[PDB]
Amino acid sequence: GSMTRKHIHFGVLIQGAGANMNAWKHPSVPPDASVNFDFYVDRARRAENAGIAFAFIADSAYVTPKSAPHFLNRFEPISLLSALAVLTSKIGLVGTMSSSYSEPYNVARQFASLDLISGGRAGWNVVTSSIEGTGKNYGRPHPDHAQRYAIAAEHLDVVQGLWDSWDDDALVRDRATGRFFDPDKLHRLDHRGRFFSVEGPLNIRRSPQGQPVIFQAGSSDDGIDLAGRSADAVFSNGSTFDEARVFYRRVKAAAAAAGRNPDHVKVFPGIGPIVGATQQEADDKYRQVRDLLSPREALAYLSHFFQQHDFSVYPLDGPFPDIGTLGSDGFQSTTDNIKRLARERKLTLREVAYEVSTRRSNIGTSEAFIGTPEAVASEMIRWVDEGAADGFMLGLPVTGFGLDDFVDHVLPVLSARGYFDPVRRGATLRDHLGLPYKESRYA
């Protein structure tokens, strides 16, 4: 009965086995979850049946023998989302694609086709920066980072221009006269910019939501500004509450400065809640998640910060050793953080290794989102009440039990408190998110 009760929007990041890099080891998922199509269908349906607004498929296009399991082998988003569309009915279908390594005409067509097949449920997560090295797969081994935002802005402008090629009513298909379309309702783009030259028109029409929804995750000054000028929904990962609140305020002001209505720029911080009936049960699940990293893996990553020091020689459950003499390869501030922690808390080597590891391996998991359904719901409500979120991007450490727990135990508590409507009516992704139908620039 809070005076500020409102529906909290949710999306779910389906990162194969889980947001935790070692989630493939957890028994609640199949080991090949990341490239197991039926697993994605099960998880998308689980989310859809709970009233989660969209499924989000993040992406990468670069591999090394050190890449995390999900980055070593994953589905490609247009193909995956198009297959999922046809086995679902309401849930949004949001896919990552890079501005630097895609032709805008192809992006426009592939996302427009997903949008039409799905009945207006497509979203495009516009990625401005890619993993370092990605350019090596596209004949551009040294990208000019300084231009990555200018490139992305123009690329997006081209895609959206192409999406307005065909007025909603252009395709007349008059069998009496033989007139298939009204020529004055088809538009050329004639884009000639610094980075792209694209004449158009596009060869596919607009969807029941007008155009696909634009997601972005810029965090730099330029990133936030691009989001304010061009995103419908903005996400993050790893933020504390105070950080998220600053981010929320900056994105909304950036929207207002661009002459847009900030009410229609949704902010969705990433979180990875872990719930149990008691704090003890939540904590046990969190320990399970922690132990997905073996002791050796925890130590190998500590070794990284101390010039490849071999920490395997020390007893795991003995005190963290006096390694103060050891240097670091430019991570001296991190090694200082590690040593301060070890000294201020009487930590063992195991506790230090996992502190470092577990924190970094689950960046959207903080202790405020670990506990009982009521406590975890209360924290989500707090983030929304206090202006850090309009909704959340769920990045669950393990996609199996993580999502099951969340949908079975958290959502019903939120619903009971007036902060989640599981049966929001709406054909389209825009409808779910409370965004207005996207009219053509030529309407």
Place this chain on the structure above:
Amino acid sequence: RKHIHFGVLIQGAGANMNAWKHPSVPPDASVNFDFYVDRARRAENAGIAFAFIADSAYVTPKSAPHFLNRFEPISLLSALAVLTSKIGLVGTMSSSYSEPYNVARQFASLDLISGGRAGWNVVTSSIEGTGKNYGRPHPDHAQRYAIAAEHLDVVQGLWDSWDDDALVRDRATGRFFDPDKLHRLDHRGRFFSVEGPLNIRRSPQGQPVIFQAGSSDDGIDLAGRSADAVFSNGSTFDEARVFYRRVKAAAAAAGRNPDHVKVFPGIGPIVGATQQEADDKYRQVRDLLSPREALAYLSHFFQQHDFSVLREVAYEGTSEAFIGTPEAVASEMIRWVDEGAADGFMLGLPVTGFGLDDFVDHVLPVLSARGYFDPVRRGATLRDHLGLPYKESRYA
């Protein structure tokens, strides 16, 4: 005794540019997903080995109805995959206007989702003006074939990134993969530079099946060296046969088994119970284009001259030989296979509704009765359906 393979081109409403007017299809067929599902399943239930989605990426006010508005192939094929089970899934994508790493990922993903049913139709030249949508208003002219060859080499190299047994995912030890079973490409050529590895594994058929449609000397050479199946464009049996022999000769010269390069002429059969009924159906389809329209299109070629003051010229494979009774049309198809013009056929039906219904219900059963078509697709992969072996990795 000698199984004839079939693919079906699903060109929305039909191969006839005015197919949208025909009552056996919905007016919006070309962008009606449920209609593509219905047609794909109709073909699949009949034992047709693959659905083929052709493509374009340039539009003008004068473009044909299907070219004005169509689905994109990766998205369409991936949606069709999960509503079908056996049928092959073949999509056009251009070598000139796509990044090979993206092509590799998109087709490998389709391949994996579909259980090994993907095919890629590699198009070397696109429709004139396509380059204006990709910042290259006057593209490669001579070097389209060299770009296509290197692009394909990159994609196939990328598809062998992951040995079939590399992803051990051993929960007892925590070893996710064998690092010696993952390969970099490190391709540095004239047109492309791509390091690899790809971030997706190989499918149950190894790699997607490669289709090509080259007709020039360079086209034929490329197909003989690198195609698994080749689409042929003959309006006549003699043309088809000259083409077929050239492709098989190019395969031998490339050191390959010519029987593993399958040649599929495009045909559009029109059947009826009698020759008269078949001819009536032909006229009906032909009449979807008004003589006024046809003579107007003709006029644009010959200096805007008014030719109203010729019919066959104006309008102009369905041959005449593929217009007739089910038995006669089956006999002609059998003749093309037995006399060395075809290993199978790509069905480009004038209207995808009645055309496919007639073909599957009346012609295929005749071919089966004569020993030229096993309607049961027993294998799982597109390679299986086409009689091709599993594609082992270059590193196997």
